[PDB]
């Protein structure tokens, strides 16, 4: 009758997950009441504290653990293998793995067990994947029009446009009126690393691309990456960068965006930042000084290995597996992922077409897509296959639009035939990689920021590459190359 789940949700959503409409209806459908431990900030740290202290729930919902965490928990018996539960009790999930058997292999550890239940979302394939570019660049076209400027075609054009934004006062002469160039530095949708590809090769959140010769390339020791840093340094020197770029957060970024203070900025979807208007548009791919014109592929995809694990203290495995399988029912997967219908107290993502028993996206009418989604989605394990569109659900309007923009602006310049596959490394290789990344990851962004602020990259570049080798870069690369070769060979 009752299960205790830890979960992760947005701070815009209710403290008690059971106040969400989806979870009220789901309790009626399943007959199971969930008592939630709901962490709405710093989920991973609070989860790790619970595991370390022995305060385990029946299952961790919407978990998102790394592979190294996954295998360590499995080795210590914190979580259990689940392939037998799938086989015995999970017909919805088994049907998905029968329609797309490639996912079975992505769920299976090198020891042959399955330890977690995945998120699956089919939106485009290959270069056309919705994930191929995360930190899209957007520009204020109203300012271009007001100042009599053409859309930049080159990185040199971009400098001149941004200087016009600073010197030409398109939205007022105040010291803080116009922010020519802004970003949230680091990983994710708001970083500036998209532009590094205008110097060839570019960069992504893994700092890892795959050459057309089949050689895995760590991007952050490339001469091309040095030239990218120097370009951003020029913008800094010219007084063109948001003075709080390296300190602000998403809520501040969004507040500045809503006031339309940005000339050029980065985000997944402009509608979350500068709003639903034609004042901002996609910045087309720029040519660099030598004619480099490129879009680096991310290694993102519509799959996450672990959106749920079952702990060793769960005493109702059949009930838990059946609850989880209910999330993989198509109409439930769509709603858990995106929101729901029929709330009279709150805007709805969907309406339910009674006749066809299917879901149809409603217009957002100016509401930010991520804001309403955060309030009403559930997350957790689920599956959305491209066969569902036109049958179970409409394709989201924002998703279709973004797929069209990727195809129009970016795919022609995505010249790497491959990106880096989603591999499942052995526990030994995972722990070697995790020790190297404990040094490398923070160091890479620290130096990048330092160089943008101090201008000393030419003096320090060689020492920096030596430091990366001290931290184990060549071993790191050899391991990534091993698993790439093993993936291509197919074990």
Ligand X SMILES: OC[C@@H]1O[C@H](O[C@]2(CO[C@]3(CO[C@]4(CO[C@]5(CO)O[C@H](CO)[C@@H](O)[C@@H]5O)O[C@H](CO)[C@@H](O)[C@@H]4O)O[C@H](CO)[C@@H](O)[C@@H]3O)O[C@H](CO)[C@H](O)[C@H]2O)[C@H](O)[C@H](O)[C@@H]1O
Q: Would you give the binding string for Ca ion spanning residues 381-420, x where CB under 5 A is met? A: ----------------------------------------
Residue 371 binding: pick among Ca ion, ligand X, none (C-beta 5-8 Å cut-off by kind) = none
DSSP for 78-107, please give it: SB---HHHHHHH-HHHHHHHHH-THHHHHH
Residue 36 binding: pick among ligand X, Ca ion, none (C-beta 5-8 Å cut-off by kind) = none
Q: Would you give the binding string for ligand X spanning residues 187-206, x where CB under 6 A is met? A: -xx-----------------
Stretch of 106-114, 224-232, 394-402, 415-423 lying at the interface with ligand X (CB under 6 A): 394-402
Residue 272 interacts with ligand X (CB under 6 A): yes or no? yes
Looking only at the bridges linking them, the beta strands covering 179-181 and 136-140 are: unpaired
Q: Which is nearer to Ca ion, 83 or 169 (CB)?
A: 169
Rounded to an integer, what distance in angstroms lies between the CA atom of residue 216 and that of residue 218? 7
Looking only at the bridges linking them, the beta strands covering 280-282 and 179-181 are: unpaired
Q: Which residues contact 208 (CB under 8 A, 6 or more apart)?
A: 216, 217, 218, 219, 299, 420, 480
* Residues paired with residue 2 on neighbouring β-strands, in sequence order: 33
Residue 121 binding: pick among Ca ion, ligand X, none (C-beta 5-8 Å cut-off by kind) = ligand X
| Token digits of residue 8 | 């992760």
Residue 269 interacts with ligand X (CB under 6 A): yes or no? yes
Closest listed residue to residue 379, CA positions, set 61, 16, 13: 61
The CA-based dihedral angle spanning residues 328, 329, 330, 331, taken in that order and rounded to the nearest 10 degrees: -120
Contact 398, 369 (CB under 8 A): yes
Q: Which is nearer to ligand X, 297 or 373 (CB)?
A: 373
| Token digits of residue 94 | 């088994």
Residue 380 interacts with ligand X (CB under 6 A): yes or no? no
The CA-based dihedral angle spanning residues 481, 486, 125, 69, taken in that order and rounded to the nearest 10 degrees: -80
Q: What are phi and psi of 8, to 5 degrees?
A: -120, 130
Which of the residues 112 through 131 are near ligand X (CB under 6 A)? Answer: 121, 130
Residue 467 interacts with Ca ion (CB under 5 A): yes or no? no
Select the residue interacting with ligand X from 50, 398, 437, 475 (CB under 6 A): 398
Stretch of 196-204, 367-375, 413-421, 461-469 lying at the interface with ligand X (CB under 6 A): 367-375
Minimum gap (Å) between residue 375 Cβ and ligand X: 9
Q: Which is nearer to Ca ion, 58 or 221 (CB)?
A: 221
Residue 188 binding: pick among ligand X, Ca ion, none (C-beta 5-8 Å cut-off by kind) = ligand X
Q: Would you give the binding string for ligand X spanning residues 61-100, x where CB under 6 A is met? A: ---x------------------------------------
Rounded to an integer, what distance in angstroms lies between the CA atom of residue 208 and that of residue 192? 16
Residues of this chain that interact with ligand X (CB under 6 A) are 8, 64, 121, 130, 188-189, 268-269, 272, 369-370, 373-374, 377, 379, 396, 398-399, 402
Residues of this chain that interact with Ca ion (CB under 5 A) are 169, 217-218, 221-222
């Amino acid at each position: 009758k009752t299960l205790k789940f830890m979960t992760a949700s947005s701070p815009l959503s209710p403290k008690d997950p059971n106040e969400k409409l989806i979870l009220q209806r789901l309790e009626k459908e399943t007959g199971v009441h969930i008592d939630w431990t709901n962490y709405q900030s710093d989920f991973a740290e609070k989860r790790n504290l619970d595991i370390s202290s022995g305060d385990l729930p029946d299952a961790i919902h919407n978990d998102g653990a790394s592979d190294v965490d996954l295998m360590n928990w499995a080795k210590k018996g914190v979580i259990i293998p689940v392939e037998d539960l799938i086989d015995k009790y999970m017909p919805n999930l088994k049907k998905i793995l029968d329609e797309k058997p490639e996912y079975k292999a992505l769920m299976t550890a090198p020891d042959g067990h399955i330890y977690s239940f995945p998120w699956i979302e089919e939106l485009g394939d290959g270069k056309e994947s919705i994930h191929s570019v995360n930190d899209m660049a957007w520009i204020n076209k109203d300012w271009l029009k007001k100042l009599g400027l053409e859309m930049p075609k080159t990185t040199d054009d971009l400098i001149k446009v941004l200087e016009a934004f600073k010197n030409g006062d398109p939205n007022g002469n105040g010291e803080a009126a116009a922010i020519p160039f802004s970003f949230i530095s680091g990983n994710g949708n708001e970083d500036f690393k998209f532009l590094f590809a205008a110097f060839g090769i570019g960069d992504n959140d893994d700092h890892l691309v795959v050459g057309n010769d089949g050689k895995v390339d760590f991007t952050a020791d490339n001469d091309n990456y040095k030239e990218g840093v120097k370009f951003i340094r020029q913008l800094q020197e010219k007084g063109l960068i948001d003075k709080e770029a390296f300190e602000h957060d998403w809520n501040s970024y969004i507040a500045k965006g809503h006031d339309q203070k940005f000339g050029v900025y980065f985000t997944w979807d402009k509608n979350n930042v500068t709003g639903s208007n034609e004042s901002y548009d996609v910045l087309p791919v720029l040519a660099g000084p030598s004619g480099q014109k490129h879009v680096a592929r991310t290694n993102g995809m519509g799959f996450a290995r672990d959106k749920m694990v079952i702990t060793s203290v769960n005493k109702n495995l059949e009930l838990t597996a059946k609850w989880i399988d209910a999330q993989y029912a198509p109409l439930q997967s769509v709603q858990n992922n995106w929101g729901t219908y029929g709330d009279d107290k709150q805007q709805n993502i969907f309406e339910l077409d009674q006749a066809s028993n299917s879901l149809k996206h409603l217009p957002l009418n100016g509401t930010a897509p991520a804001e309403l989604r955060q309030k009403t989605e559930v997350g957790g394990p689920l599956a959305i296959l491209d066969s569902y569109y036109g049958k179970v659900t409409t394709m989201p309007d924002d998703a279709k639009w973004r797929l069209d923009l990727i195809k129009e602006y970016y795919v022609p310049y995505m010249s790497n035939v491959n990106n880096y596959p989603r591999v499942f490394m052995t526990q030994e290789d995972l722990d070697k990689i995790a020790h190297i990344e404990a040094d490398m990851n923070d160091y890479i962004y620290r130096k990048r920021a330092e160089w943008i602020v101090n201008g000393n990259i030419d003096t320090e570049w060689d020492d920096y590459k030596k430091e990366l080798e001290k931290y184990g870069l060549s071993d790191y690369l050899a391991i990534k190359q091993k698993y790439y070769d093993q993936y291509q060979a197919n074990k």
